[PDB]
Design a protein around this ligand. Structure first.
Ligand SMILES: CCCCCCCC/C=C\CCCCCCCC(=O)OC[C@H](O)CO
Ligand SMILES: CCCCCCCC/C=C\CCCCCCCC(=O)OC[C@H](O)CO
Ligand SMILES: CCCCCCCC/C=C\CCCCCCCC(=O)OC[C@H](O)CO
Length: 203
């Protein structure tokens, strides 16, 4: 554990809280793709399955439980409460063409053919493309009412801090993860497309 994975996770957490609090106060999830939020909740579900097998630290367990509870609550706030503001007519990305290749990719490319390692690799590959339904929604409508600039800021700071996390990890520990780094580059390119679409079409 280093400071850039630490702050990157906190930056990742800050954005999730911003979106969860924005939907709650505005009583609205218009412009948000619940399919994307469902995928990010599936990411935390398959990434943190090690809670039923391995308790590492109180901080480590709390972050997992907070990540899971926060994105689960966002999904509840989109599909049950405030569902009258869910723009389901535009959140129409056929995500089966996404989880099936990602699932097959995690089945074939992993660090170990172990159940928990396969589902961790799935979460890493799924998290890299989970933003695709939301990008499909924004490009179609050109609108994203619930999306605020500072929500993007902590999304970019999160990916940018994991950029430093990869570098500090290699130079000070000799650790390098081809699977996570490659998927992270895919996630970063798509997240810049998120930021570019917001500036050019929304803001
Ligand atoms: C058990 C041991 C665990 C060890 C874990 C160690 C984690 C790294 C901690 C401190 C290094 C701080 C490095 C200095 C950071 C400087 C930041 C900086 O230069 O920022 C530039 C700024 O953004 C405009 O230039
Ligand atoms: C002796 C080993 C016992 C392991 C038993 C499983 C422990 C973790 C269960 C649920 C985590 C989330 C529960 C909901 C938190 C709110
Ligand atoms: C109005 C319509 C708005 C649509 C707005 C775009 C929606 C994105 C949909 C499809 C892009 C195809 C998927 C592109 C990203 C997946 C490809 C990928 O990451 O492949 C892995 C890499 O290329 C190998 O290492």
């Amino acid at each position: 554990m280093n400071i850039f994975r630490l702050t990157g996770d906190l930056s990742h957490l800050a954005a999730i809280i911003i979106l969860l609090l924005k939907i709650w106060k505005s009583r609205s999830c218009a412009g948000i793709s619940g399919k994307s939020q469902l995928l990010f909740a599936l990411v935390f579900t398959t990434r943190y399955l090690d809670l039923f097998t391995s308790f590492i630290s109180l901080y480590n367990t709390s972050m997992k439980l907070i990540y899971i509870a926060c994105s689960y609550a966002t999904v509840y706030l989109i599909y049950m409460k405030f569902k009258a503001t869910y723009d389901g007519n535009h959140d129409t990305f056929r995500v089966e063409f996404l989880i099936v290749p990602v699932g097959g990719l995690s089945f074939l490319v992993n660090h170990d053919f172990s159940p928990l390692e396969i589902l961790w690799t799935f979460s890493i590959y799924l998290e890299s493309v989970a933003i695709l339904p939301q990008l499909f929604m924004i490009s179609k409508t050109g609108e994203a009412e619930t999306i605020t600039t500072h929500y993007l800021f902590f999304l970019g700071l999160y990916r940018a801090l994991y950029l430093v996390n990869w570098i500090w990890r290699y130079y000070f520990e000799g650790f390098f993860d081809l699977i996570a780094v490659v998927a992270g580059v895919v996630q970063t390119v798509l997240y810049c497309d998120f930021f570019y679409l917001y500036v050019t079409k929304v803001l």
